[PDB]
Design a protein around this ligand. Structure first.
Ligand SMILES: O=C(Nc1n[nH]c2ccc(-c3ccc(NS(=O)(=O)c4cccc(Cl)c4)cc3)cc12)c1ccco1
Length: 288
């Protein structure tokens, strides 16, 4: 049989795994032969209420993941056709860094190794000419042997042929607290804009995804209670002014400087994912 065809009749829902604004990801057992064991798979589906523009983007998302092959990117397994389409990916037993970090003992060197694998997947993603737009700890997953896998591509976009950015409009609903000022102000999401999001993800790693130190709580503390384009505006006001997330508790200064370098106001002055890989390898070596 075609390894990419999953018939609904052999899919059995275990539990939910994650929920975004547009999609839902659940764990299923695939057992065509009713053998008791079966194969565990993650199935992502578009929520009811997504209009034709979201439905088209959903087709492009499935196609982007079909295309990506990297050790630090969640593997595409196939599709489940109804009348709607569900995206079948591999099951990664350790979950997201947002759910793994608050309850596990993770030393600085292992945190830096996690950050490195993110960069490796991210450098491959940028080489294939794609931007991610949602690089947050919650979208980074751990497989067997704590092997990192970027797990969600819902906002990923193809960067046109010879361009350094994709023009993407209005949304105070998107991960705005992980966003560089240039895509908040100019609606231009550069390759360097994803590097800014890495800096925030590294901050999340160093705060062990502590909800009290979270970008939401820290930026809500400054901006207050805001929604939509009001959040986008108030944040832009803070960022190009020079305001950045604080140095997390127990974070060595040189790591915070790495965060700050990913947070340069001028997009062209931020390191590339290609440059970040050896920097983190050395940082990883420095501590144990
Ligand atoms: O989670 C597991 N196992 C997985 N195996 N395979 C997977 C593929 C993707 C996800 C996944 C990806 C992203 C998010 N973030 S989000 O909730 O904010 C979100 C954002 C945007 C869209 C959607 Cl839909 C969800 C959550 C889960 C998880 C697994 C797991 C947990 C414990 C052990 O194992």
């Amino acid at each position: 049989s075609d390894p990419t065809v999953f018939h609904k009749r052999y899919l059995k829902k275990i539990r939910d795994l994650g929920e975004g604004h547009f999609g839902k990801v659940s764990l299923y057992c695939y057992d065509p032969t009713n053998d008791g064991t079966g194969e565990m798979v993650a199935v992502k589906a578009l929520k009811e209420g997504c209009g034709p523009q979201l439905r088209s983007g959903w087709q492009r998302e499935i196609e982007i993941l079909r295309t990506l092959y990297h050790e630090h990117i969640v593997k595409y397994k196939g599709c489940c056709e109804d009348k709607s389409v569900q995206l079948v990916m591999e099951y990664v037993p350790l979950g997201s860094l947002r759910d793994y970090l608050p309850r596990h003992c993770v030393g600085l060197a292992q945190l830096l190794l996690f950050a490195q694998q993110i960069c490796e997947g991210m450098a491959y993603l940028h080489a294939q000419h794609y931007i991610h737009r949602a690089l947050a700890a919650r979208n980074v997953l751990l497989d067997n042997d704590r092997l990192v896998k970027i797990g969600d591509f819902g906002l990923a976009k193809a960067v046109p042929e010879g361009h350094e950015y994709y023009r993407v409009r209005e949304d105070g609903d998107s991960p705005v607290f992980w966003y560089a000022p240039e895509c908040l102000k100019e609606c231009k999401f550069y390759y360097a804009s994803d590097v800014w999001s890495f800096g925030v993800t590294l901050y999340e790693l160093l705060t062990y995804c502590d909800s009290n130190q979270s970008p939401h709580t820290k930026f809500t503390e400054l901006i207050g209670h805001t929604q939509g384009q009001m959040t986008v505006l108030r944040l832009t006001e803070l960022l190009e002014r020079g305001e950045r997330l604080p140095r997390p508790d127990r974070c060595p200064c040189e790591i915070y400087h790495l965060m700050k370098n990913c947070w340069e106001t001028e997009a062209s002055f931020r390191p590339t994912f290609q440059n970040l890989v050896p920097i983190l390898q050395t940082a990883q070596e420095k501590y144990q």
